[PDB]
RNA sequence: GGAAUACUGCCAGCUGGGACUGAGGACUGCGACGUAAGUCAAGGAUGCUGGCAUAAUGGUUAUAUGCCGCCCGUCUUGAAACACGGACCAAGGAGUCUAACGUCUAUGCGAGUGUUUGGGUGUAAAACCCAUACGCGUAAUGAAAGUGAACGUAGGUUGGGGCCUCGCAAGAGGUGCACAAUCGACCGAUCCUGAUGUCUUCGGAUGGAUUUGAGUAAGAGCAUAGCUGUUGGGACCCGAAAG
RNA sequence: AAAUAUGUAAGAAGUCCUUGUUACUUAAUUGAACGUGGACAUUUGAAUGAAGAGCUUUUAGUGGGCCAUUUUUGGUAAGC
RNA sequence: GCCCUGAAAAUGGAUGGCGCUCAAGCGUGUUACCUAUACUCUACCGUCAGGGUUGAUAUGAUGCCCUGACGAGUAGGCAGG
């Protein structure tokens, strides 16, 4: 016997592959894990793990985002990196010009870029024009935005939000959830 | 009973509910009917139109 | 049936030495106590208010607040498997800064000084205490010392 | 694929540390010790000796 | 028919299985319960030197 | 699919999945909600704060509607003109031919100023306007005109 | 191409012959630090005789320990120490810098180890037959000296006698070169255990605890 | 006084007998012995010889012999139990479908999204096609009347992957999305402040505060599908005394 | 007044020097918080270990226990 | 100290049995020997981890390949068949 001090055959609880069946995903991975391997480059590491990732792991990232991401000083003329799904934004007006490799553009934001004079991208397309992933802005969505994550540690005086299914006042509203009715929270 | 985190439901089936179950199986003969209804119709309104 | 009040159990936790009753002596309402401050808690038994509760007699916790008469201590507790945080408004007479820190310091402003020394020299530092060491060999001299030699006693009574 | 001990087999003995070499040639596993006539004060076998 | 009434037995082992660990600490922490005239001119304290640090960049 | 469903992976043990012990009985601790007040109150209070009890007005025949109001924020708003004729007016910015939004036509019903609009001439109809929105109008040489 | 590969070979051809002579120099210093020190402790004994006096050794600065309970049943303060001293596994066993912060541990871990103070031959040959490194988790056998210099270059030690060296002279980087060593598998004694019942001390008639000098001779029928 | 021997210990001193194993399959490594060409026990066995044909050998099977082996299923702290059920065999025999849902995942489109009430159409319950609505989402808060989200590169501070610069490197500086802690600003509630005005009681600007909200602060949702989980249903299957 | 148990500390979220903000506070730029700028990284402040650390969502079964050394209470005692 | 008395229960019976008296009993010591699914080295199965390799280069890229460690299991969860 071994006096066992960790949880044996356990596993990362890291994915190793995509979990989708998308031919092409499945080419853009084998792709990458070729960068990643030969290339002591950081992004495609970054890139490779990245394709891996499940829908909501992957938020999209908006136009807008990218618009102020490029506000960044010494950002200007970087390609920007969406691995991911770039949407339209009606709230910008100006648009920059540069690059935007992303999984898939939105019929808006594919036009949104392209109109203010810029280039839409793949990232095998990316890949070419810098295999060591140079000059390159990775970009990420805001995950926590998710209506999901609003009724997360829902617990008393946790200030989360009730799974509830039709909302108004009659609706837990009352005892409990006010001085005059019992208590609060 | 209660348990766990979720939502409250609202289910109204503790009323013998299996003896009022109406499913559409015939939605697609209906529309062959309704529009046969309709040429037939449409034909001894002479010209009128329907 | 059980009993479990605030003060259960603390006759003699909460009670004075013997001989040392009566007024708080006046270094106690002299200290003065700073946000970060390391305090030991421990109850005075005349003074009945502002007075820690029995969990935290000989805890010792951080100050996180200053007040007219109180301190604010935090305190990590365990509850389950995890520790929790507590914020205790203790008064003053409950309260003492904690000697240990007190000789951190001093240990710092002497480890700086040492290594001022060490490059003002320009010479090798070593800052870290070492434990104490097995102790290298040693001639002991038998002048005026011709071992004494024992051995063991019988038995007796002597009631 | 297979671990070879240095105990036995010369061959990974001299891999492994050269002068072993020397140390066998030299002998030294031997070796006899410098001589010396230093004798024990009285002192020393008196209390040795004592009851 | 009567039974086992209490016992803390097994208790620490479940507790110690992903247990303990240590506290969550952070710079800055909570300012839970410091007192509010103070927090209120800190404010200040802070609203200042910002600007005039900004100042300083023009 | 059945053929996918953890049952099929039970057959030959026992019980199920359900234990040998607590079984699996027919309602332990009652149908539905049964003592959301008693022995289930501590999943009702958190879980469900606010739950029991009454709070506020009744409104004996509320008609749904009658408070139909939909809000659109400057945020958007010029999303409302035609998309094509979005960059004429946009570069034109003239007060003597300013375009004109009839929100009430595009499904609306009250202007809010959650964002920015650029500074160029709007007219904006619209029934009900918050006091911000209406002043970052004004501020980019548009005007309100209230409708019905 | 064919020109540049023996230009690249005799390069290490070259540099492996010069690592080969460091080596054999260094092993010879040793065998002569050693071959000193032990002499002069000799007749410092023999000196401090004729004067009248006595000398008293230096306290031992290393002890190796065996695991010789199995892993059932131990009380949690001990098994925490049996961890830490990475003796999760009778009779597996390792080198110890005795200390009094180390000391105590010991002084719990007591009843279920064996232990006392190794001789040259008995830490020579532990590693040799039976020293395997830690390289990224793995444990890797020690049967060229491009391993050890590989990984504990950084602090001189680029031989498996460098590596002994640091271990019986404890000294500046024991403590990464001692952790470099896997814990030692082995075996059960053959010859036995020279006691009726092993889980008495060694002053009771029977294994455990601090039997000194006698360790060699357990560990080099277990090695 | 000169020795020897025991005891203990070291030798990278030499050597006899016996046992089990022989994974791997071109070369590549570190070495050793040689003046040498070369050789070697140096990153895992080869050489020589013999034996087997209605046979050597191995598989199964029956029996015998040595040691060992209580009846399963079940509830139970505890069953081989002097606890229950089960004489035997075949066939049947128990977590389902559904309405509405949590999480996770795949996929379509995305500030939207959902063709299938219906219509068009047809090779006719299919496939192909579609207008207006409607649902959910893009606004919150308050019991309600109601009001309703930028002082600022949509703020400051601290961590931050990746990218950019310098350096041969170790390093240093710049930028810093996601996420995390903290200070702040905005919207609503509550309690204050009550300007310019007005038809003298209407109006509510501005500045506030250990209060409060399932909010704001360059949107993420909608839909189909799957496993697990939730509630109602005969509700995993069989079972009352009763009404 | 033990033994065994038990709290905290052993630094980068640190140290010093210079002088910034404030409506708090002082008789007082005096403090108190929080900072700009400057200086200190070989042992950077005891030991051993770390089989990686950190974190989020969600759901099963369980919620009759029993036994041994020791400490212990009720009972004459008990396989209580 | 060992031995003897104090020492009475119901089928026929139990240092486990035979049997054992300078023991094959009691106290103590010293060697040798027997034996576990444990320990040591090795082959194989699997699980986990780290790593190499589709550069033109026939048949497995969720693939070939290298290395290290690990393996009890009711109620119960997931996985691959």
Redesign the pocket.
Request: hydrophobic share 30%; net charge positive; proline share 4%.
């Given at each position: 016997?071994?006096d066992?001090?960790?949880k044996?055959?356990?596993?990362?609880?890291?994915r190793?592959?995509?979990?989708?069946?998308?031919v092409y995903?499945?080419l853009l991975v084998?792709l990458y894990?070729?960068l990643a391997?030969?290339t002591d480059?950081?992004?495609?590491?970054?890139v490779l793990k990245a394709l891996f990732?499940?829908?909501?792991?992957?938020?999209?990232?908006?136009?807008?985002?990218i618009?102020?991401?490029l506000?960044?000083?010494?950002?200007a003329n970087?390609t920007v990196?969406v691995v991911?799904?770039?949407?339209?934004?009606?709230?910008?007006?100006?648009f920059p010009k540069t690059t935007v490799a992303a999984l898939?553009?939105?019929?808006?934001?594919?036009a949104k870029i392209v109109k203010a004079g810029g280039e839409c991208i793949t990232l095998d397309q990316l890949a070419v024009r810098?295999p060591?992933?140079?000059?390159?802005?990775?970009?990420?969505?805001?995950?926590?935005?998710?209506?999901?994550?609003?009724?997360?540690?829902?617990g008393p005086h946790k200030?989360?939000?009730?799974?509830?299914?039709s909302?108004?006042?009659k609706?837990?509203?009352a005892r409990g959830?006010?001085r005059s009715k019992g208590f609060?929270? | 009973?209660?348990?766990?985190?979720?939502?409250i439901?609202?289910?109204?089936?503790?009323?013998?509910?299996?003896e009022r179950?109406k499913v559409?199986?015939?939605?697609?003969?209906?529309?062959?009917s309704?529009?046969?209804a309709?040429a037939t119709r449409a034909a001894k309104i002479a010209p009128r139109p329907l | 049936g059980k009993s479990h009040g605030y003060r259960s159990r603390t006759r003699?936790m909460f009670q004075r030495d013997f001989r040392k009753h009566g007024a708080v002596h006046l270094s106690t309402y002299l200290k003065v106590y700073?946000?970060?401050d390391?305090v030991?808690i421990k109850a005075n038994g005349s003074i009945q208010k502002g007075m820690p509760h029995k969990f935290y007699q000989?805890?010792?916790?951080?100050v996180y607040n200053?007040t007219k008469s109180s301190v604010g201590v935090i305190?990590?507790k365990?509850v389950g498997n995890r520790?929790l945080e507590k914020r205790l408004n203790l008064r003053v007479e409950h309260i003492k800064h904690?000697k240990?820190?007190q000789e951190?310091?001093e240990?710092?402003?002497a480890?700086?000084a040492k290594?001022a020394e060490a490059?003002a020299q320009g010479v090798?530092?070593?800052?870290?205490?070492?434990?104490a060491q097995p102790r290298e060999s040693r001639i002991v001299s038998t002048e005026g010392n011709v071992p004494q030699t024992l051995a063991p006693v019988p038995y007796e009574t002597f009631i | 694929?297979?671990?070879?001990n240095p105990?036995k087999?010369?061959?990974?003995?001299?891999?492994?540390?050269?002068?072993?070499?020397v140390?066998?040639?030299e002998?030294?596993?031997?070796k006899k010790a410098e001589k010396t006539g230093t004798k024990p004060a009285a002192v020393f076998t008196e209390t040795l000796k004592h009851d | 028919?009567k039974?086992?009434n209490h016992?803390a037995?097994?208790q620490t082992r479940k507790a110690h299985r992903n247990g303990i660990?240590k506290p969550?600490?952070?710079?800055?922490?909570?300012?839970?319960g410091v007192?509010?005239?103070?927090?209120?001119?800190?404010?200040?304290?802070?609203?200042?030197?910002?600007?005039?640090?900004?100042a300083?960049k023009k | 699919?059945?053929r996918?469903?953890?049952?099929?992976?039970?057959?030959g043990?026992?019980?199920?999945?359900?234990?040998?012990?607590?079984?699996?009985?027919?309602?332990?601790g009652?149908?539905?909600?049964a003592g959301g007040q008693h022995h289930h109150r501590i999943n009702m209070d958190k879980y469900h704060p606010?739950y029991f009890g009454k709070?506020?007005?009744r409104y004996f025949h509320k008609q749904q509607a009658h408070?139909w109001?939909?809000?659109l924020?400057?945020?958007?708003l010029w999303?409302l003109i035609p998309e094509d004729k979005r960059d004429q007016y946009l570069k034109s910015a003239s007060k003597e031919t300013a375009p004109v939004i009839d929100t009430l036509a595009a499904?609306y019903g009250?202007?809010?100023?959650?964002?920015?609009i650029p500074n160029v001439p709007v007219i904006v109809k619209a029934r009900?306007?918050?006091?911000?929105?209406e002043e970052?109008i004004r501020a980019a040489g548009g005007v309100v005109e209230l409708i019905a | 191409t064919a020109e540049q590969v023996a230009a690249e070979?005799a390069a290490?051809?070259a540099a492996?012959?010069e690592?080969?002579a460091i080596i054999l120099e260094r092993?010879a210093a040793?065998?002569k630090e050693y071959e000193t020190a032990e002499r002069n402790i000799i007749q410092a004994k023999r000196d401090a005789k004729a004067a009248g006096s006595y000398y008293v050794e230096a306290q031992h600065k290393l002890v190796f320990v065996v695991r010789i309970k199995?892993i059932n049943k131990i009380p949690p303060?001990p098994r925490k120490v049996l961890?830490?001293?990475?003796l999760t596994?009778?009779?597996?066993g390792?080198f110890?810098?005795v200390?009094k912060?180390?000391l105590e541990?010991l002084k719990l871990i007591e009843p279920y180890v064996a232990y006392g103070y190794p001789?040259?031959?008995?830490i020579?040959?532990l590693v040799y037959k039976?020293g395997?490194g830690?390289i990224?988790?793995?444990?890797?056998?020690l049967?060229?000296?491009?391993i050890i210099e590989a990984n504990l270059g950084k602090y001189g030690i680029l031989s498996i006698?460098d590596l002994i060296h640091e271990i019986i002279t404890v000294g500046?980087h024991?403590?990464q070169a001692?952790?470099f060593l896997?814990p030692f598998?082995?075996?059960?004694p053959s010859?036995?255990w020279?006691v009726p019942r092993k889980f008495k001390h060694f002053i009771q008639?029977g294994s455990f605890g601090n039997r000194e000098?006698?360790i060699?001779?357990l560990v080099?029928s277990?090695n």
């Open positions: 016997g071994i066992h001090t960790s044996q055959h356990k596993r990362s609880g890291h190793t592959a995509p979990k989708s069946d998308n995903l499945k084998k894990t070729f391997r030969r480059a950081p992004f495609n590491k970054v990732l499940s829908k909501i792991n992957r938020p999209p990232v908006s136009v807008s985002r618009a102020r991401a506000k960044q000083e010494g950002a970087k990196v991911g799904t770039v949407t339209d934004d009606a709230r910008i007006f100006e898939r553009f939105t019929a808006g934001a594919r810098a060591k992933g140079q000059n390159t802005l990775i970009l990420r969505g805001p995950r926590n935005s998710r209506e999901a994550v609003r009724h997360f540690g829902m200030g989360k939000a009730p799974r509830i299914l909302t108004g006042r609706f837990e509203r959830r006010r609060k929270v | 009973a209660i348990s766990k985190n979720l939502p439901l609202k289910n109204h089936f503790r009323k013998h509910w299996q179950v559409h199986f015939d939605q697609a003969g209906k529309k062959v309704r529009r046969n309709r | 003699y700073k946000v970060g390391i030991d000989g805890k010792t916790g951080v200053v305190i990590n365990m520790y904690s240990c820190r951190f310091l240990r710092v402003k480890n700086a290594r490059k090798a530092v070593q800052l870290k205490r070492q434990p | 694929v297979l671990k070879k105990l087999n010369k061959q990974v003995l001299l891999r492994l540390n050269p002068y072993a070499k140390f066998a040639a002998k030294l596993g031997s | 028919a039974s086992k016992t037995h097994n660990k969550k600490t952070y710079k800055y922490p909570s300012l839970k007192d509010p005239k103070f927090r209120r001119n800190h404010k200040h304290a802070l609203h200042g030197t910002a600007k005039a640090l900004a300083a | 699919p059945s996918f469903t953890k049952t099929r992976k039970h057959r043990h026992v019980s199920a999945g359900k234990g040998r012990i607590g079984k699996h009985r027919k309602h332990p009652g149908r539905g909600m606010g709070v506020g007005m408070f109001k939909p809000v924020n400057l945020d958007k999303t499904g009250k202007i809010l100023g959650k964002g920015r009900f306007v918050s006091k911000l929105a970052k | 070979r290490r051809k492996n012959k690592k080969r092993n040793y065998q199995g303060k961890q830490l001293l990475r596994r009778i009779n597996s390792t110890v810098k200390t912060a180390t541990l001789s040259y031959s008995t020579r040959q039976r395997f830690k990224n988790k793995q444990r890797v056998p049967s060229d000296n491009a006698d500046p024991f403590k001692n952790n896997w598998k082995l075996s059960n010859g036995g020279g008639g000098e006698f060699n001779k080099k277990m």
